[PDB]
């Protein structure tokens, strides 16, 4: 039984409204409604892991496993494996994977975030999930974040908290928020965006959306803006939306958007909108395809409809040599010339970086680099030749172009984190000085550059 070296991952987001679910719900596990959708052709073909985020669930853990295993079953006759599940007030995940996996999946690791403060405290964060699947690492973050047209900076404001506090994927990472720590992650969830136009254009919006043009209402989402404008998911990916807003609709319909202000919405309108949403984030050169992203029209339970995306993953398997793991493998090194760090600080302390990799056997601390001004006023820190040798533990080059080292820049008057990167070792050539190059983020915001030349050497 051959590893694989590519899996696919279907990823599902419902604000369920607060409603139990109707008795089928398989056009949302089979990709089938508005926008991308997938063959009819492959419908009896299991995705290798299922991801079901929920929002607003009024379910019990026990009553929601029975429905989506029940669901898959009949799609696919598969019965899943509970991976994980876990639950903040209503917001919930779900890890569903074929049985032929459950040996491949280790490192299980559950959390939550609550967002807000005293008043804005109580229903609204984010549940995540992580694991190992053979070598590479996923993560999974389904959030809820704050309501209304305009809060977009508080929803803003709960990213950041979500993503600095939840802890996921390995400890060891220490200096890497979940932006850093997997090969892929996946973020989705009602992350609550709206389109901002005047409320009194409520039945233009409508139109145009019954006529399936929605160029003019996706230039005004507060997502797409807030992301060009790199205020929010910095360096993360969404498919092109090609189906109508998820949100509001009258129950039991999909015939009608109810966007006026009510007593119940606290006299706020809803202008339909795209809160449902799948966004995801990979090391640099691995395999992700997006295969589908569209919204159900057939589950009418919710004033939300699901939100379906699945994709490609590339995926490595858990290599052992005749020497790493448990030593080094003296055939291979990676070596680093011309580097420096370009950060946007306006202190003055002393810098040095640490190397991070599952390819090391542990994480290696450089000497301290040396500073200069930049000609626009910006500090660079020099490196010049001087980073150390990094020793890998398997120097095959089928394992080892296929890793990744992350990069800290640390004060050395603090030893915190100024900026976080990632470098690829899927080079175009091996003993070969190769221009190397990351952004720096830190709690994900940019804090500045890393580049240089790298050199490669593998046991070819
Ligand atoms: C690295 C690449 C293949 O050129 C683009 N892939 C992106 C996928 C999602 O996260 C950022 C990287």
Same mark, same amino acid.
């Given at each position: 039984?051959?590893?694989?070296?590519?899996?696919?991952?279907?990823?599902?987001?419902?604000?369920?409204? *607060?409603?139990?679910?109707?008795?089928?719900?398989?056009?949302?596990?089979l990709s089938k409604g508005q926008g991308k959708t997938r063959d009819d052709s492959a419908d009896?073909?299991?995705?290798?892991?299922?991801?079901?985020?929920?929002?607003?669930?009024?379910?019990?853990?026990?009553?929601?496993?029975?429905?989506?295993?029940?669901?898959?079953?009949?799609?696919?006759?598969?019965?899943?494996?509970?991976?994980?599940?876990?639950?903040?007030?209503?917001?919930?995940?779900?890890?569903?994977?074929?049985?032929?996996?459950?040996? !491949?999946?280790s490192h299980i690791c559950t959390d939550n975030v609550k967002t807000g403060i005293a008043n804005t405290l109580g229903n609204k964060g984010a549940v995540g999930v992580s694991f190992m699947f053979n070598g590479t690492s996923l993560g999974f973050v389904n959030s809820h974040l704050t309501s209304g047209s305009?809060?977009?900076? !508080? !929803?803003?404001?709960?990213?950041? *908290?979500?993503?600095?506090?939840?802890?996921?994927?390995?400890?060891?990472?220490?200096?890497f928020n979940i932006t850093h720590r997997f090969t892929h992650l996946f973020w989705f969830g009602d992350l609550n965006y709206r389109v901002d136009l005047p409320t009194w254009e409520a039945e233009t919006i409508i139109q145009?959306?019954?006529?399936?043009?929605?160029?003019?209402?996706?230039?005004?989402?507060?997502?797409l803006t807030e992301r060009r404008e790199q205020k929010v998911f910095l360096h993360f990916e969404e498919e092109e939306i090609?189906?109508?807003?998820?949100?509001?609709?009258?129950?039991?319909?999909?015939?009608?958007?109810?966007?006026?202000?009510?007593?119940?919405?606290?006299?706020?309108?809803?202008?339909?909108?795209?809160?449902?949403?799948?966004?995801?984030?990979?090391?640099?050169?691995?395999?992700?395809?997006?295969?589908?992203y569209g919204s159900t029209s057939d589950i009418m339970t919710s004033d939300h409809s699901p939100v379906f995306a699945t994709?490609?993953?590339?995926?490595?398997?858990?290599?052992?040599?005749? *020497?790493?793991?448990?030593?080094?493998?003296?055939?291979?090194?990676?070596?680093?010339?011309?580097?420096?760090?370009?950060?946007?600080?306006?202190?003055?302390?002393?810098?040095?970086?640490?190397?991070?990799?599952?390819?090391?056997?542990?994480?290696?601390?450089?000497?301290?680099?040396?500073?200069?001004?930049?000609?626009?006023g910006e500090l660079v820190v020099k490196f010049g030749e001087t980073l150390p040798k990094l020793k890998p533990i398997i120097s095959d080059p089928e394992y080892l172009l296929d890793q990744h080292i992350l990069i800290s820049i640390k004060s050395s008057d603090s030893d915190e984190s100024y900026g976080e990167g990632?470098?690829?070792?899927r080079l175009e050539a091996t003993e070969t000085?190769?221009?190397?190059?990351?952004?720096?983020?830190?709690?994900?915001?940019l804090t500045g550059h890393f580049q240089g030349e790298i050199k490669l050497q593998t046991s070819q």
């Open positions: 039984q051959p590893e694989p070296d590519m899996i696919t991952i279907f990823i599902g987001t419902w604000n369920m409204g *607060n409603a139990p679910p109707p008795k089928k719900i398989t056009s949302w596990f009896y073909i299991p995705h290798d892991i299922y991801v079901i985020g929920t929002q607003e669930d009024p379910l019990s853990e026990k009553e929601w496993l029975e429905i989506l295993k029940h669901s898959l079953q009949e799609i696919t006759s598969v019965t899943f494996k509970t991976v994980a599940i876990h639950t903040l007030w209503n917001i919930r995940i779900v890890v569903l994977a074929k049985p032929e996996h459950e040996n !491949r999946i305009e809060k977009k900076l !508080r !929803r803003n404001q709960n990213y950041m *908290n979500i993503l600095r506090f939840l802890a996921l994927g390995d400890k060891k990472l220490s200096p145009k959306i019954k006529q399936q043009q929605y160029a003019d209402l996706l230039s005004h989402d507060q997502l090609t189906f109508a807003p998820t949100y509001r609709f009258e129950r039991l319909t999909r015939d009608k958007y109810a966007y006026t202000k009510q007593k119940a919405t606290g006299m706020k309108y809803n202008l339909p909108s795209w809160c449902d949403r799948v966004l995801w984030k990979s090391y640099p050169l691995v395999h992700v395809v997006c295969q589908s994709f490609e993953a590339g995926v490595t398997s858990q290599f052992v040599s005749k *020497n790493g793991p448990g030593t080094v493998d003296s055939q291979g090194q990676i070596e680093f010339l011309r580097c420096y760090a370009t950060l946007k600080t306006k202190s003055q302390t002393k810098f040095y970086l640490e190397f991070h990799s599952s390819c090391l056997e542990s994480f290696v601390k450089s000497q301290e680099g040396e500073n200069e001004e930049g000609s626009e990632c470098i690829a070792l000085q190769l221009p190397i190059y990351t952004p720096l983020t830190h709690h994900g915001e």
